[PDB]
Curated annotation (Swiss-Prot):
Family as reported in the entry's similarity comment: Belongs to the thaumatin family.
Transmembrane domains' residue ranges: none
Pfam families assigned to the protein according to its UniProt record, in alphabetical order: Thaumatin
Species per Swiss-Prot/TrEMBL record: Thaumatococcus daniellii
Task performed by this protein: Taste-modifying protein; intensely sweet-tasting. It is 100000 times sweeter than sucrose on a molar basis.
Subcellular location(s) per record: Cytoplasmic vesicle
CDD domains documented for this protein: TLP-P
Disulfide pairings: 9-204, 56-66, 71-77, 121-193, 126-177, 134-145, 149-158, 159-164
Protein name: Thaumatin I
Keywords: Cytoplasmic vesicle, Disulfide bond, Signal, Taste-modifying protein
Cellular component terms per the entry's GO annotation: cytoplasmic vesicle
Keyword Zinc among UniProt keywords: no
Length: 207
């Protein structure tokens, strides 16, 4: 499947793509403002994620650090990134269908639209200014808006027992972005697409 990743933000981002124990495609690449990078993701990929990283420095071997979404200091991500990270999430060819969503469960760093480029389903978007409006206690000094699990490490925010409810913090993300997951047991905002659709992830789709 192809995913065209487009950076419409006015700042550089380093895109990242992983399924948690492996890179998808090259795993990561710099996108200056306006650049597009098309990756190929193997059919059947389960639990894949794409995100942006901000304020990265890499040396000549692809090693360094990012202020958000850093994946073990690598340019080419093999693992998931450090919160806060707005997440484009997808499982492809799952019994004939693809499933996509956007999640704020690991916080928010960069606004995002995640849409099919082929027929048969709708896209999802969380493009509100969550960093500017971020509650004081969730603000990440490194940049971005942390989820409450990351900040407070309770069973309630982290849904560790499988039995959690919405919270004042989850409701803030859900208020600014109704179409994204705000906590682990949020009412699903997953979209079912035909098996083997292709997609575009656009950072800053409205700024």
């Amino acid at each position: 499947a192809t995913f065209e990743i487009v950076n419409r933000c006015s700042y550089t981002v380093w895109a990242a793509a992983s399924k948690g124990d492996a890179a998808l495609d090259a795993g990561g690449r710099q996108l200056n403002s306006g650049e597009s990078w098309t990756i190929n993701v193997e059919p059947g990929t389960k639990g894949g994620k794409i995100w942006a990283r901000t304020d990265c420095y890499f040396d000549d071997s692809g090693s360094g650090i990012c202020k958000t979404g850093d994946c073990g200091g690598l340019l080419r991500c093999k693992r998931f990134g450090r919160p806060p990270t707005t997440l484009a999430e997808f499982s492809l060819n799952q019994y004939g269908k693809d499933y996509i969503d956007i999640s704020n469960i690991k916080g928010f760093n960069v606004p995002m639209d995640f849409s099919p480029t082929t027929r048969g389903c709708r896209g999802v978007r969380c493009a509100a200014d969550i960093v500017g409006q971020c509650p004081a206690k969730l603000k990440a000094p490194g940049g971005g808006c942390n989820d409450a699990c990351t900040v407070f490490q309770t069973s309630e925010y982290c849904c560790t027992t499988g039995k959690c409810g919405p919270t004042e913090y989850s409701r803030f993300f859900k208020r600014l972005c109704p179409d994204a997951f705000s906590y682990v047991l949020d009412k699903p905002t997953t979209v079912t697409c035909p098996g083997s659709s292709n997609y575009r992830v656009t950072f800053c789709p409205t700024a």
